[PDB]
């Protein structure tokens, strides 16, 4: 019933994937070996949403892990939690992508992509109602962009009707861990706009801000940022796993949060995010929880919503919560910040409540926002893309892997139109 | 008295229905296991069996397996016949087109099969009770299918519906204007009268009168059970001047399109607070003619009443009912329409309301429910048409509906039909 | 009442027969050892002996030793007379020619010897019950031999047959079209009426109604036992308006060729599910006139009924039977042929169905079985002729049959004979 | 009752034979000495299908082991399981065949063949109903082709009516352990098409693929490939040894799987084939079992079924299995892959279920498929045959052993017609 199949590509995807299943297995009380030891029956009632089953209680999570070099996956396999995945799911190559989109999309991803579909289809025909696919990758890299966009395009052809949501890392506004991020990112966006139903744009820089600003923990970067991301994506799919007063769904959010086909890039947020030492100095009531969702302090995207206007907003609360407070506060938010919401949409907030909270908490909520302020991000990428491309900065690496500079112009022209479309919805009615 | 069928559609209908059938079991003293403890009234809503286990005469439908699954595993699992609880495979996704054209029709025939097999096993059948929500895919798209199907196979039989009309300001979804208006276009010609209720109004009453700061749908649905219980009490319990199911439409529907009587109830008082009150017949009666006690957040004083049904309950002296009703007819603020001098319909049953265990509301010796039909509701329709026009003017969400086998012109026809509804209300509000 | 002989042919017949005789022992309380615990009914199916061990009046034949060997060593080894269980040396290999021309005739005379010795030891003999399968060599080729032989030596005596007609889509073999059609050509003129059943339909009912996800032939054959038990109940147990064996052919066979009444049964409800049901006479009666409850996957609404036999069982009020049957006669969807105004045959016996230990179906106080004859079955024959024509057009498998002493023209005659059967059905479906 | 007599010729045949009886003896609980120690009575009920009997419980398997040199057979005799065979059955020569078909068919097999029939007839008249013969050999070699084809021709003359199925190793598409494989194979096929009722074409290369791809065991080649083969052939004859809901038979499969006399070369498949370490991460239900039968990953022939179309298909399941699932899945397979089946045959799947599973399992199934894709194999052999024969590559060795080049032309012309016939059944109806 409403089965989801998980895809993770690239080094970032697998690590996020890896911490994505350590959280879910904790919610359902699933031992790393795959043996159930939970306490509440609701965990088993929908355990089939993510986990298959093998006699003896062994629950097999249907994730498909793909990367062009064995490096990262070998770490996951040797991880403490690597004993759970079906060995047949790991799809590993032997020549990783050197951050060039063309290699992971034309010459190297093409050779490995056919193998992955052979593993998706088995996990696709083993589900009685397959709701939609899930994908986690990075635009900047080569494998998360090249093959990720190649794979998302393929699964669109066979499963046009099914949902396909993407949690994707976006290049940071000012810092960069790769030099060719504009080329790779620009090509990736031109390829997602046509295939992906909903995308959750996130960036490390903004997510770094949460670590030291609202939390007080400087030591970790990748062991914990992924855990915030994992909690966020888990919140989105909670309604399909536990009972709720107002149950939501990947299709419900898409309809509510996607006015037009080409405007589907959101920016998530999560709460509560309190430090262990300051937690006892804070109330856990609904009102305060809702206040921090709409502040740029707790936005996992680099774009500040203040500069733009919200088009659609979705909240997915959790735990035993009073639905009156869940609704009075949203009416309060809309009126207080009337300039932050577009007039041509009378209502911009979607609510959903789940009875069971996340592990270690009694209250939580995942924010999903469609704001025109995200156009700044693409605008910025285009500025960087045109500057490098204006002199053919690195095109020789990309042309030499079965590609043409005409595609770059198409990717720049299509990107320019996405920015323009978001800009049209800044004006008010009439 | 003769049987009446209940059809619960969508998450709202299923969740609301469970609250209702908790009351029925308590009124007739039926154990949650389905077996009565170790009489002629329950036959209208409960079907007999060779054993002592009576079966509710209701059908539950929901395109999403999640909501009904809670019932199928709850303490009422043994109460319902397993085939009654109909469940789909995927939700309608708050899409009118899905629940009405593509996925709604995949399971519509299955529901009819259980309605026919349940409708045929009664010598007589008053009609159908239908619970749904305007602001959903299943509760708005799938409902319209049943209203159409139930209009042909069982035409000329009563089809009463309680509906969660969209709230004026609060909203738990974004596409309420599109979905809500579409069903109204199709349900206008295939329904008798719709008992609208708004969650905003019920929340306001709960905090204002019930004096509990943190309500939930589990609490409101229990209040909604009371209006259903009082409405259908005449079909179960003896009492002077009983009101049958088919009498509501005649009294409260002057014209085929004007069939939206907003619900009202009294008294809603907490147990502790009730000890300081007298609860006289006029007190509860006059409590229903103020805009602070309504299940739909509309101000009656803005518009004019044109029909009212009063269903008194408990130990009631009808003489006091006659006196109390007469007073309301001679107040300037209270304003009825010119062409309806005879604008009331009384109903009494000798059965005081029952208190659900652990419930919030008190054990009132007497209660009253009103089903007034007022032209002030045209304000709500105009507001809904205003919100719809804002979105469809820019064509902001149609692509979801068009891709679900829905023609573009349907939105155009839907608004035009509602536009005529506004004018129809306007003409009725004046005198020729 | 007088005796009736059962002849079980092929793996289907032998395996199905064992399910039947488990029921008979339970109905009459006969121990599996053959000895009754420490009356006049069982004489029809059981032969007496000086000791307390009664012998079933049935014969089992199978060209493959494997199937019967299970019976010969099972818990029913002492129930059957050792000579009744006739076994060959090699299987017919899903070949009509082998079981009808070459190997079938090597053992046919042996079977007749036991039929005669068993038929001669009864003062009267109603007829023969024959269980076989169209989709086998033994069940189709050897059967045709017995039908021919049993038509001469015992002509003018009833020959009823339950047959596993090929399923529409599912198939456990490749040469079903050739084999199935060939036997129909030979069995049309040497049979009274054939009670067709499809495994696809029975599987669908089992998962749809019996609510068990993983059935097996051991489970279906128990369901098939019920239709046989209800059909033959009138010959064993007392009851008002008993129906004899020879009455079926007169009522359900308007013309010699049109003798294919598909089977139907009701109620098929699981033990737990039955507690939520009433099981009134009309309920079970109306359950047999929908295409979701049939043993042959054919839609009656596509065609027209032309004869129906209703064999009610258990504590039945015939007045309700008369009322329930009358209602079915006045529904537009239900359509009988123009030239058969009198299209029913009722039968009642005061013996409720018995539950096999560990069985799936519940202990129903009342049950009904229908043997309707419908022209909608012509669709199945047309489909079978279509599949046959696809293969024989290219001459894809005849070499197996020709090498087994079978002339080439037999396939040509077989299809032409079935072609006339289609036209015969078509004419009966209209009015002159 | 329905007795089978086993023939094994050549080095490959004996080794496959040797591991063929180690499996059956395990199923019936027969000690290597020939003493029964089983637990279930069904083992004895049909033990006479393969094993004769001698007072004291000694069960003698009626296999006939023939080879032109004592080498291989001496290994079997000295094997741990060699004490079971009747010493009189070993038919050994003194000058083995040098992989030349003529020597093992004209000059050397002719001298030894008369001795073998003297041993078959004794095992033939000791059976009350002899169903058919069984033969295991290799086409590439000289003894498995020369004398194997000579012997199969002889037993056809005396026992025309009896069944005669062949499990034969076919030359691999690209690798070859012998240089004259086309000459030997081509002559063998021209001689089987007229005598053998059903042939199970298998090749090491395809069977190698199973070892490392679906299993994960690189060390063995011949000790285990033969065991997969032995399990396959055991599945085919299970219905004659154990009770079943829908009992099958060598004649039942022939009729279902052989539309025309000259189209009888199938290609087997077996399941489940899981590695010991990944087995616990897999369900053993019917649906998954059936999926891998129709994929070229689990086909013991080098020919991929995708390039061609199935003519007839047979499945022989085992164990306690729900016949509804056994039948719903096949309907599912036919509709999903409607292009893989010929239209002029309305139904292409034959099912058979046995109650008793193979040793060490609770579920199993043997696939037997007649596909026109097998014509590629003969087409390939002809390409190789014509190239060598175009210049008389090695004819002098074959002519000098009582043979004529006219026979090679007949073998090439007859082979060409077999390829042509399979090609006619690629077109659709009308
Ligand atoms: N009074 C009351 N209203 C409810 C309840 N549950 C949901 N609703 C209302 O239902 C409206 C939306 O329609 P839903 O019922 O949630 O959606 P649906 O009918 O299940 O259709 P889908 O979108 O396909 O799931 C919300 O705005 C709620 O106000 C309930 O338990 N009680
Ligand atoms: N209902 C039911 N049908 C069965 C059973 N066993 C076999 N069949 C049907 O029989 C059909 C094929 O004919 P079989 O009975 O198997 O073959 P046969 O009559 O033994 O003739 P041979 O081929 O010579 O063995 C299959 O398609 C099955 O549907 C059974 O136990 N119950
Ligand atoms: N959140 C998160 N991001 C990561 C992690 N590892 C890498 N990334 C991001 O992924 C990008 C590098 O992509 P990468 O996977 O190495 O490229 P590819 O695998 O060759 O396609 C960098 O911009 C990082 O910010 C991680 O563990 N967590
Ligand atoms: N499966 C299998 N094949 C074998 C084995 N031994 C040899 N073969 C095959 O048999 C062929 C050689 O045939 P061989 O028996 O040596 O020739 P012959 O005995 O002189 O007729 C080679 O192509 C091998 O692939 C074995 O143990 N198992
Ligand atoms: Mg819903
Ligand atoms: Mg048989």
Residues of chain A found within 8 Å of residue D283, distances taken between Cβ atoms:
52-55
Alpha helices (runs of H) in D214-259, residue ranges in sequence order = 222-236, 250-257
Residue with tokens 């045949």: D13
Give partners of C (≥3 CB pairs < 8 A).
Answer: B, D
C11 lines ligand 2 (CB under 6 A): yes
Cis previous bond, B267, omega within 30: yes
Mutate to test the pocket of ligand 3, among A76, A138, A143, A207 (most ligand atoms within 8 A of CB): A138
Question: Do C203 and D324 count as a contact with CB atoms less than 8 A apart?
Answer: yes
Q: Which helix (H) or strand (E) holds B195?
A: strand B193-197
Question: Which residues, including other chains, have CB under 8 Å from residue D98's CB and lie 6 or more apart?
Answer: D142
Q: Which ligand is nearest to the CA of C172?
A: 2
C-alpha–C-alpha distance, residues C296 and C384, integer Å: 14
Question: Do B174 and A252 count as a contact with CB atoms less than 8 A apart?
Answer: no
Q: Which of C63, C93, C65 is nearest to C178 (CA)?
A: C93
Question: Which residues, including other chains, have CB under 8 Å from residue D160's CB and lie 6 or more apart?
Answer: none
Query: Is C280 in CB contact (< 8 Å) with chain B?
Result: yes
* Bind-site residues of A for GDP: 11-12, 138, 142-144, 177, 204, 222, 226
CA of A160 to the centre of ligand 5 (A): 23
Question: Do A327 and B91 count as a contact with CB atoms less than 8 A apart?
Answer: no
**C-D Cβ pairs (cutoff 8 Å, strict):** 109
Label residues D17-27 b or e (16+ Cβ within 10 Å = b).
bbbbbbbbbeb
C-alpha–C-alpha distance, residues D121 and D113, integer Å: 13
Q: Which helix (H) or strand (E) holds D422?
A: helix D405-424
Q: Which of B271, B67, D149, C258 is nearest to A354 (CA)?
A: B67
Q: In this complex, which of D284, D288, D291 lies closest to A55 when CB atoms are compared? A: D284
Residue D357 in tokens: 């599973």
The total of other beta-carbon atoms located within 10 Å of residue A197's CB is 19
User: Whose C-alpha lies nearest to ligand 4, atom 21?
Assistant: D143
SS3 C55: strand
CA of A207 to the centre of ligand 3 (A): 14
C-alpha–C-alpha distance, residues A358 and A373, integer Å: 30
Angstrom CA distances, A63 to A88, A134, A150, A223, stand at 10, 9, 18, 20
Q: Which ligand is nearest to the CA of D14?
A: 4
* Cβ atoms A264, A201 nearer than 8 A: no
Label residues B143-152 b or e (16+ Cβ within 10 Å = b).
bbbbbebbee
Residues of chain A found within 8 Å of residue D282, distances taken between Cβ atoms:
54, 86
Residues of chain B found within 8 Å of residue C334, distances taken between Cβ atoms:
none
SS3 D235: helix
User: Whose C-alpha lies nearest to ligand 2, atom 1?
Assistant: C221
Question: Do A2 and B95 count as a contact with CB atoms less than 8 A apart?
Answer: no
C418 lines ligand 2 (CB under 6 A): no
Which region, left, alpha or beta, applies to residue A328 given φ > 0 means left and ψ of -120 to 50 means alpha?
A: alpha
Q: Which ligand is nearest to the CA of C174?
A: 2
Q: Which of C146, C129, C121, C126 is nearest to C62 (CA)?
A: C146
**Smallest CA–CA separation between B25 and chain A, in Å?**
23
SS3 A277: coil
Resolution in angstroms comes to 3.5
Provide the 8-state DSSP code for D344: T
C-alpha–C-alpha distance, residues A219 and A202, integer Å: 21
Query: Is C276 in CB contact (< 8 Å) with chain B?
Result: yes
DSSP output for B381-402? HHHHHHHHHHHHHHT-SHHHHH
Question: Which residues, including other chains, have CB under 8 Å from residue C340's CB and lie 6 or more apart?
Answer: C254, C306, C307
Q: Which of B72, B78, B60, B64 is nearest to B20 (CA)?
A: B60
* Cβ atoms B229, B27 nearer than 8 A: yes
The total of other beta-carbon atoms located within 10 Å of residue D40's CB is 11
Mutual angle of helices B143-152 and B104-119, in 10-degree steps: 40
Provide the 8-state DSSP code for A33: T
Question: Which residues, including other chains, have CB under 8 Å from residue C156's CB and lie 6 or more apart?
Answer: none
Q: Which of C128, C162, C158, C147 is nearest to C57 (CA)?
A: C128
Residue B221 assigned as binding residue: yes
Label residues B200-234 b or e (16+ Cβ within 10 Å = b).
bbbbbbbeebbeeeebbbebbbbbbbbbbbbbbbb
User: Whose C-alpha lies nearest to ligand 4, atom 17?
Assistant: D141
Q: In this complex, which of A2, A324, A347 lies closest to B203 when CB atoms are compared? A: A324
Catalytic residue among B148, B247, B283, B290: B247
Query: Is D260 in CB contact (< 8 Å) with chain C?
Result: yes
Task: Give Dmax (Cα) for chain C.
Answer: 65
Please give the number of the atom of ligand 1 that sits closest to the Cα of B98: 24
Q: What are residue A4's phi and psi, to 5 degrees?
A: -120, 135
Question: Do D245 and C203 count as a contact with CB atoms less than 8 A apart?
Answer: no
C-alpha–C-alpha distance, residues D153 and B339, integer Å: 108
Residue with tokens 């005598």: D195
Residue C339 in tokens: 């030239």
Which region, left, alpha or beta, applies to residue D34 given φ > 0 means left and ψ of -120 to 50 means alpha?
A: left
Q: Between residues 36 and 65 of chain A, which touch chain B (CB distance below 8 Å)?
A: 45
Residues of chain D found within 8 Å of residue C216, distances taken between Cβ atoms:
245, 322-324
Q: Which ligand is nearest to the CA of B66?
A: 5
C-alpha–C-alpha distance, residues C54 and C37, integer Å: 11
Q: Which helix (H) or strand (E) holds A156?
A: helix A148-158
C-alpha–C-alpha distance, residues B143 and B191, integer Å: 11
Q: In this complex, which of D277, D281, D291 lies closest to A58 when CB atoms are compared? A: D281
Strand partners, C7: C59, C130
* Cβ atoms C259, C193 nearer than 8 A: yes
Q: Is chain A adjacent to chain D, meaning 3+ CB pairs within 8 angstroms?
A: yes
| First-to-last C-alpha distance (Å) of chain B | 42
User: Which experiment gave this structure?
Assistant: cryo-EM
D72 lines ligand 4 (CB under 6 A): no
C-alpha–C-alpha distance, residues D324 and C167, integer Å: 13
Q: Which helix (H) or strand (E) holds C25?
A: helix C10-27
Three-state SS letters, A61-115: ECEEEEECCHHHHHHHHHCCCCCCCCCCCCEECCCCCCCCHHHHHHHCHHHHHHH
* Cβ atoms C137, C175 nearer than 8 A: no
Residues of chain A found within 8 Å of residue B90, distances taken between Cβ atoms:
2, 129, 131, 251
Q: Which of D189, D341, D349 is nearest to D257 (CA)?
A: D349
C-alpha–C-alpha distance, residues C138 and A185, integer Å: 71
User: Whose C-alpha lies nearest to ligand 3, atom 15?
Assistant: A11
C-alpha–C-alpha distance, residues C343 and C373, integer Å: 10
CA angle C164-C166-C169, nearest 5°? 135
């Amino acid at each position: 019933m409403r089965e989801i199949v998980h895809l993770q590509a690239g080094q970032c995807g697998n690590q996020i994937g890896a911490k994505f299943w350590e959280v879910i297995s904790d919610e359902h009380g699933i031992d790393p070996t795959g043996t159930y030891h939970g306490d509440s029956d609701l965990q088993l009632e929908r355990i089939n949403v993510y986990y298959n089953e093998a006699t003896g209680g062994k629950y097999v999570p249907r994730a498909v892990l793909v990367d062009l070099e064995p490096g990262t996956m070998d770490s996951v396999r040797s991880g403490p939690f690597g004993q759970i995945f079906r060995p047949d799911n790991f799809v590993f190559g032997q020549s990783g992508a050197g951050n060039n989109w063309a290699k992971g999309h034309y010459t190297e991803g093409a050779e490995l992509v056919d193998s992955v579909l052979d593993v998706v289809r088995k996990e696709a025909e083993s589900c009685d109602c397959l709701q939609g696919f899930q994908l986690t990758h990075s635009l900047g890299g080569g494998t998360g962009s090249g093959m990720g966009t190649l794979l998302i395009s393929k699964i669109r052809e066979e499963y046009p009707d099914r949902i396909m949501n993407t949690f994707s890392v976006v290049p940071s506004p000012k810092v960069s861990d790769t030099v060719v991020e504009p080329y790779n990112a620009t090509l990736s966006v031109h390829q997602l706009v046509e295939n992906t139903d909903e995308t959750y744009c996130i960036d490390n820089e903004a997510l770094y801000d949460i670590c030291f600003r609202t939390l007080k923990l400087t030591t970790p970067t990748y062991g914990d940022l992924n855990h915030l991301v994992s909690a966020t994506m888990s919140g989105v799919t909670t309604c399909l796993r536990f009972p709720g007063q107002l149950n939501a769904d990947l299709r419900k959010l898409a309809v509510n949060m996607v006015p037009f086909p080409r405007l589907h890039f959101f920016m998530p947020g999560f709460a509560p995010l309190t430090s262990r030492g300051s937690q006892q100095y804070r109330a856990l009531t609904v009102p305060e929880l809702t206040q921090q969702m709409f502040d740029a302090k707790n936005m996992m995207a680099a774009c500040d919503p203040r500069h733009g206007r919200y088009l659609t907003v979705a909240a997915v609360f959790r735990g035993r919560m009073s639905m009156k407070e869940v609704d009075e506060q949203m009416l309060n938010v809309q009126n207080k910040n009337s300039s932050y919401f577009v007039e041509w949409i009378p209502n911009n907030v979607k609510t959903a409540v789940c009875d069971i909270p996340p592990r270690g908490l009694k209250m939580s909520a995942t924010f999903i926002g469609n704001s025109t302020a995200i156009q700044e991000l693409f605008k910025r990428i285009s500025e960087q893309f045109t500057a490098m491309f204006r002199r053919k900065a690195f095109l020789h690496w990309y042309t030499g892997e079965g590609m043409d500079e005409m595609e770059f112009t198409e990717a720049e022209s299509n990107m320019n139109d996405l920015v323009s479309e978001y800009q049209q919805y800044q004006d008010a009615t009439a | 008295m003769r049987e009446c069928i209940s059809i619960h559609i969508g998450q709202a209908g299923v969740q609301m229905g469970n609250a209702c059938w908790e009351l029925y079991c308590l009124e007739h003293g039926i154990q949650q296991d389905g077996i009565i403890p170790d009489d002629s009234s329950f036959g209208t809503f409960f079907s007999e069996t060779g054993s002592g286990k009576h079966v509710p005469r209701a059908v539950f439908v929901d395109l999403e397996q999640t909501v009904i699954g809670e019932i199928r595993t709850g303490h009422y699992r043994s109460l319902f016949h397993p085939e009654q609880l109909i469940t789909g495979k995927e939700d309608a996704a708050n899409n009118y087109a899905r629940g009405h054209y593509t996925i709604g029709k995949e399971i519509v025939d299955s529901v009819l099969d259980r309605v026919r097999k349940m409708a045929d096993q009664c010598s007589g059948l008053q009609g159908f009770l239908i619970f749904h929500s305007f602001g959903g895919g299943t509760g708005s798209g799938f409902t319209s299918l049943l209203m159409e199907r139930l209009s042909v196979d069982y035409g000329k039989k009563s089809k009463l519906e309680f509906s969660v009309y969209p709230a004026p300001q609060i909203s738990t979804a974004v596409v309420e204007p599109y979905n809500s208006i579409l069903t109204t276009h199709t349900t206008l010609e295939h329904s008798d009268c719709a008992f609208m209720v708004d969650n905003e109004a019920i929340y306001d009453i709960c905090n204002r009168n019930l004096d509990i700061e943190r309500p939930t749908y589990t609490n409101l649905n229990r209040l909604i059970g009371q209006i259903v219980s009082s409405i259908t009490a005449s079909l179960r319990f003896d009492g002077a001047l009983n009101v049958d199911l088919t009498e509501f439409q005649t009294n409260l529907v002057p014209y085929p399109r004007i069939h939206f009587p907003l619900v009202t109830y009294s008294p809603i008082i907490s147990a502790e607070k009730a000890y300081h009150e007298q609860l006289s017949v006029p007190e509860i009666t006059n409590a229903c003619f103020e805009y602070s006690n309504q299940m739909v957040k509309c101000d009656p004083r803005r518009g004019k009443y044109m029909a009212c049904c009063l269903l008194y309950r408990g130990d009631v002296v009808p003489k006091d009912v006659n006196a109390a009703i007469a007073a309301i007819k001679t107040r300037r603020s209270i304003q009825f329409v010119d062409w309806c001098p005879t604008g009331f319909k009384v109903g009494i049953n000798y059965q005081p309301p029952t208190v659900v265990p652990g419930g919030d509301l008190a054990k009132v010796q007497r209660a009253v429910c009103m089903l007034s039909n007022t032209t002030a509701i045209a304000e709500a329709w105009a507001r809904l048409d205003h919100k719809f026009d804002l979105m469809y003017s820019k064509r902001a969400f149609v692509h979801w509906y068009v891709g679900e086998g829905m023609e573009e012109g349907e939105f155009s026809e839907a608004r035009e039909d509602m536009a005529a509804l506004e004018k129809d209300y306007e003409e009725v509000g004046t005198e020729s």
